Amino acid sequence: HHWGYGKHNGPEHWHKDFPIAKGERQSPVDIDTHTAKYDPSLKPLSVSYDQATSLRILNNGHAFNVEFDDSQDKAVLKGGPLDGTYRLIQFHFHWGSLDGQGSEHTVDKKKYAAELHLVHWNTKYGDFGKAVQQPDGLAVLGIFLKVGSAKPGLQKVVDVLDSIKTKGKSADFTNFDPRGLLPESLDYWTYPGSLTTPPLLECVTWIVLKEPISVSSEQVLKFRKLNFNGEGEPEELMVDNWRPAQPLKNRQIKASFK
Template sequence: MTGQHCWGYGDEDGPSEWHRYYPIAYGNRQSPIDIISSQAVYNASLNPLVVSYDHCTSINLSNNGHSVMVEFDDNDDKTVISGGPLDGSYRLKQFHFHWGTQQNSGSEHTVDGKSFPCELHLVHWNAKAYSSFGEAASASDGLVVIGVFLETGGNHPGLNRLTDALYMVKFKGTRAQFDNFNPKCLLPSNLEYWTYPGSLTTPPLNESVTWIVLKEPIKVSDKQMGKFRNTLLFSGEEEDQRVHMVNNFRPPQPLNGRTVQASFKC
């Protein structure tokens, strides 16, 4: 078992076993973390986060066996974020989700020990400093991920097009065209955030991510969350055993002396 094929979210290949193939799992800036709001340091010099997704080009929707993902054309600077804790702009590469089986578990980051049913990750890379996403993913300042919590409430109109399309990528390894989707509709109106230096939350667990975790969740319906839990499978179409894609999250990791900064006063 090598590379990307040796990990998952089961008892034998889940997060507690990842260190066997990825020793950096015990590194000093691993993600996710539990954000203790009272210990976050307000930094008045942090700028507002600027999201410029208006000209983004979504390409496809896919099931990679670990999550459902929407990929974007990242060949130019039309789709970028800037401001916040960032020195420059970072291009959007993809977004994906992590979720659980019930309302009180599923997010990767937690806040004061509280978990949310789901967490959205919008993954960006430093195209000014690096020539490819792969190169950026192994550099300490290569990636920026915006984390958005999903909590159950009313129906989220912006999410409907995605949840209605999940049946097309039910099985691991499937992909479907998914164009003209602007992920700005998945952001809350309030972009106040916590930020800290961290890592990818899936193997290879590179410590290359500046995390921007938004304080305000978006509200989605039980029906919408149900489509994630009941439609998608960890298994491929050719496999006899059909395993629902749930609990695809890594638990919080030690902070190891890192400072979590806040763009807002508690």
């Protein structure tokens, strides 16, 4: 039936309905830190989220998305390998059933407990819909989450999760500041890729931060209490909603740091 992360509709099945699954620039990929090359042509990365307007949080049966108002440039990503301005539309996470797995991208094969994706679209293309029809339509800022100390800026998300336990549920989630989810350093790796979930469109410039943010065991645990299924259907814990590393093929990963 519908794609998912189960044994019969998981990552290894997606190619049947979404051929691009075996394309040339699929994500995520393993980040070989030694093979990644520092790039001088990379302009300073700019993350301007002070005017961010969060609107709501929703369970789409695959993960939960915190959406933002992107009708105006309020939260934009610029600089780095990007040409132009990209507006934040939503962010979500990917996590595992255990602390030892969960991230989509990996660093020297190392898997983190989870991974944060802040999705942005290129303003030159008018809307998100048109942006996903362009090779450079999107820019996703990926941040790894390791288990350790609690991340203050993530608790507001964690505490609202009970109100959107099942697929289809959503709740007002205004005045949330995404800056509270950013690590100290902005050092990153970047490469051309795709969405990590169907339709797996290859319209993404990936920017993955090197420094992980640390979250508490209890914060991650609450992520695992969510449900893939709908309210009246049998319970299936929302865990391991990540796609494994895909072939890098003809691509190079650039580092913004030497």
